[model samples]
Target chain A: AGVMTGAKFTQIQFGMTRQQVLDIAGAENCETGGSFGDSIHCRGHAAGDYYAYATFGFTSAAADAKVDSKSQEKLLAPSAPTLTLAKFNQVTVGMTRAQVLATVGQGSCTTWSEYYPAYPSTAGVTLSLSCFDVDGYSSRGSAHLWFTDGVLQGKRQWDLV
Target chain B: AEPFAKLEQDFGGSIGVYAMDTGSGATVSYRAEERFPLCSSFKGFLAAAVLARSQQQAGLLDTPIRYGKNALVPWSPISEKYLTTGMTVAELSAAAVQYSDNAAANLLLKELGGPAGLTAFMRSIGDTTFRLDRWELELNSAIPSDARDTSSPRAVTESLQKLTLGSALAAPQRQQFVDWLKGNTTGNHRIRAAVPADWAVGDKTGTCGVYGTANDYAVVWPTGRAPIVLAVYTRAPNKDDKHSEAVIAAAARLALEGLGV
Candidate 1:
């Protein structure tokens, strides 16, 4: 009640330079939009010692928003992996990636990894992968889902727990 | 009339003997039902009780058990080392009747639910005199209550009758019980001593203390004649002496001959 608290707007004038508007909005909110351009409106509001505002309302030919393809490619890069399905009751061990993928379906996201002690090697190598999907809810009961040496070990539901 | 008098004169004692021809389903002949003590011979009834209960429960005859420390009774020579633990019910039954093992008999009694259970089981089969009320205290004082339990000659004979007739126990269990009884070693003197070896005899014998008592009861199946169930009990001046055997043998022979089998 001592000081009026109400919404207020600080507008960047139409003729102002991009640097001028960025200086007004502060560097913290100026992510990826390097120097503002024509028709880009940077709005601000003063809150105590710092300004609390956003400057996303832009209408300019040069101020475009495009995702960095290189960054996306780096995020989607593959890692080595391996997987296994164990049937506990029968005491059977080891299963192939195809059998695992057939049970859980194609994973929406995947990463590969290596496993030591691979077949026929003194300390051999095996492939494994991590997988995730939007539809990967536990609809089919409890099962073993693991990755080793860049392979997809299928879903196994025979274990006690 | 003169045959028994002549035999009594020959024996020179007050003699009491009894016999029944089971195949004919009658007590073809008898001399005495009165003079026997309810010694270890009563254990046959206990065995019948154990078997009957097992049958009622649908229990297997070969169920395994361990002979724990509690099974051993006073004055018994069967130490822990000499005893075989973890035997099946059939083996325990065999050890009990065939070897007359006191520990095995006591274990079976305890397993069958103690003295009360034994009494209740016999009562279920119409036995009244052969009960815990008669021997429970004395048994509890000496051996374990179950091992010390005893019964009279008449009660033992009655129990044998019910068992052989398949009335108290199931047919198969009864057969097994009778077979085991036939293999009993204690009967070597009293009944077997008098009867011919070839004659099929299913019997049990019992002895307790010096100048106490000796008892034998049997089902004799002679060729071409009905089976006979005979019981004999004797109290000797020296109960451990071999004289009771001769007395019982004489009584058994005279009774069988009187029955003309």
Candidate 2:
């Protein structure tokens, strides 16, 4: 595959045909948008998050640079343990109480307004609800968790909402 | 009275902010009567319409709807992957609501009788201004007419109120809507961003126009406060939807502050 590095993306200039640009940057590099004839056009994202617009009429233009779309390595102070979006969402139903506690620390988990079935439940059944929060950003935070029959039933993070 | 203070201060484009306390008749309005485009946000109402119809016919929701690669269109990448696989009516409704899937919305509209059915659904729910006049990305095409889809903040709020009050669908069916709303990760940048953690919000987002016309209609339930229905719409000169989304967030904060109407 052709390189989609900063230097290559920066080399993309106006007045270049869409096909010419597409040739240099393979399908792996840029997303192709749909359009009509000269009246319509499409746009793609180049490195640095710059918009590469392909107007069918004449020119292939790109907007100002935004965030750099490069392989980046972040250097930061070592932090606390945080559940990832995947690990956080792994608290599925049919998991035992011990399993859930093992998956998400008991310290991070908190009971809702009620400890045991305080909120309304359907068909006259008892349900336990416990929420958990993590150290990282967004999806890593507290999830509105649900439990029934001593098994995890439903789990969703409010932050994800 | 200054319900839209935050939005008024932040956004320069034409805007509308409307919210109502479901328990009381208290309302927050600013240019709520003004009309704006209804991007994919109308899908919320469309979802409600589909649910209502499901009540009339048995297994209507279980009906399957297929979309091959040929049905692919712009926007909503979530629905694009399923283009070849297809989905059921209920699943498609979820895609439309939770992900704002344009293809799913278009198919749902067809089930409801095209765009006119959307108008009828809104009217049935007491929304007179909300209309779906164009298909996905069709608004950008040179069709010759200036008129596209549209709605008012007030009408959207009313429709949310109706949906919540069981006027649009029965309580059991309405609960389904609530489930979908709870699962909605679409409008977290709007009213959902205003409230604190533990608060609940059910919302739909719309983003369109050359310069970006953005809107979010939400049902906000604040802790220790009344459940409020909010709608924020904006037409900007640029495609920066984040600015419009922030405007709604700020306005929602002001509206929910002290639980004021």
Candidate 3:
């Protein structure tokens, strides 16, 4: 039992650097009396430094060990909801909606403001797509396109907007 | 108020200026209306004549032509730049009106079937005071030689009014001529000098042999105000004083201020 416990302590303590400790527990965690810097207090029965707390336990005569299960879980998990470019291409200013539709396929519905608001209340059109959100669905998004005289003029991305 | 006061001060009393408000049909306000050298100001009349004839001939304004080497005249500014080659009649007319180009004008003059064609066209329009002379005298074509190539201030204004109102030229053809003239003018003196910046002034200027003589005739379409047609001519006794600019400036300011309903 004694030999097995000694080998376990050696394996946990092997090649442990200051940077590795800080990275696992964070710099603030290192300075605070967290599990990263807590002392085992007991010397006998494999009671070494706080570095060995993960693998060792103390007797009733010594202080209790603290476990950083939250930090360990976070370090082992992955993040979600990320965006990346699928494709990009150039188009001229004279291209019409029919031409754009032929290139990018059917787009979602959208709205735009018309400068002349009299007689015929014509609103500017916007393209709809789940790829991005543009101007509260009014004038927003990267995939969203603007046109003048049926010719494409400019575009914007949801992330940038 | 005192237009002649400044005019005498500037040109030493050898200048004649005339301006009329066609909108209000106001009286002429100036020193004199006698015929001075027509210079390039006659180009306006020539253009009117061409437009008149084109109407009778039923030829499209966009007619094309090939300009040959012999068709070009020497020492003209336009001759130095463009190739002595083929260009459309519309293109030549544009160059003549826009850049005040002599070579392009002479080409168009030749293409209008020479001076006799211009004279016949003018006679058809009831304008007897203006005529075309020899083609080689670079910028000297506007001067009155005998009774043929001279135009008085009244004659110039009357011809311009007819052109602007589409009396001589057809509606579309007259508009084309006016648009070309408005786009082609290179100078900023005379009628243009007094009008508002955004106002469109379709005009042409004539200058010859130093700055002694300067002539400008224009139709002004000012926003809110009725359209006015004005003409100004200045000649210095010294013929080399370069003071005709001052005379023109003063005359334009006076005309803009006094001529009203």
Candidate 4:
């Protein structure tokens, strides 16, 4: 009833509804909060004491539907839980979207400033962003992960200050 | 104040721009000769190259080439949808142009004999400065001072002018290339954002994930005028700096204003 597993969290796709999410992760695993519209927060723990948190944006509290979703993880050690360039490079082609989210803790996003389609017509077309902490090399890290029909197709990464 | 100078100052990055009026032969050039990463924008030309090949081979565009699941790559929106059924050559070319589909572009690049082949094809079309040195994802590395998969705004404009409006391609192929560009979905925020709503514009865009590098090239048909071909490219000194679509749009506005269009 508490935090869901990363597997259950990955099951929370772009077009999923809040009820569907609750059905999967259990209502006890989520909370409601957002600025413009209804938002669902789901938390889970990874290896060690690190925890992974995911946020899904919905059109309205009444609608209880998801427009997009992003994820982040609580850092345990000073840097052990963060994504490194080596780990980013480990994310290769042919891996499923679920594989990517698992390989790299569902990265973070600025959902407040971003927009997602209410319900995208094309079920196969999806865009996901992941922001990771790159150890101590930079202030933040970014990976331009490209996916086609939910599989990792290509990628680019940069350590940013 | 001069809009171009002002925009660049506001952007805090370098902007390369070139615009030409086909009817009046008017041009506006600013850092137009410097190279910038081609990014996904090369998909437009890649599709044009496919059309050019279609001129030589009968039923080439209609031919269906099935590939394994490994053929798919990131950013390939169209090909991934039709992956199970497979896509025709024309379908792949359209996907590459309209969606900047990476797998589709790589497939077409393979058909043209890889990056070197595309470069040779551009050279065959009289472009001395255009080069495609790498494949998708890799080519998007827009490192400062590195020349891989890079083209100058002027070269892009001139070559696009030749393929789309000049004698480089057959009449049928030229119209096909222009049609693909006209239908592009990625350039709404770049050159197309500057042109009047009533005017017709066809453009291709590129975004290299590093160095704030990105670009857009277009052919515009004003209400009563012939047409205008232009390109705006940009880059920054740092790697993490984000690109500004507003800068590209502003630069396009300046180019049109400078051309008195």
lDDT of 1 by residue, B194-237 (tens): 77789888887765432435567888878776678888765434
Give the candidate number with the greatest lDDT: 4
- Clash number for every model? 33, 3, 10, 1
Residue pairs clashing in model 3 are: A108-A128, A134-A140, A134-A141, A135-A140, A142-A156, A142-A157, A142-A158, B38-B142, B39-B142, B98-B184
Question: lDDT by residue for model 2 over B65-158, one digit each (tens)?
Answer: 8865335433333344333346789888887887676667788888999888878877877777777776654533211123467778898888
Find the 10 residues in a row with the least total lDDT in model 4 chain A: A108-117
| DockQ of candidate 1 relative to the true structure | 0.00
Off by over 4 Å in 4: A1-161
Output the better candidate (2/4) by TM-score: 4
DockQ for all models, in order? 0.00, 0.02, 0.00, 0.05
lDDT score, residue B147, model 4? 90
**Candidate 1 C-alpha lDDT tens digits along A58-86:** 22335342111000001121122112232
Task: Please give, as one word, the docking class of candidate 3.
Answer: incorrect
Local error of candidate 4 at B193, Å?
Answer: 1.0
* lDDT for each residue of candidate 3 in B50-111, tens digit (9 for 90 to 100): 66667766664567665433343322223322332355666666656654556567777776
Give the per-residue lDDT of model 2 (tens digit) for A46-151.
2100122222222222332111111110111113334445666667678876787667655554322111122122222223333434542211234545555566
Cα RMSDs, all models: 39.4, 22.2, 33.1, 10.7
lDDT of 3 by residue, A1-47 (tens): 12222223233332244334334433432232222123211111211
Error of 4 at A76 (Å): 23
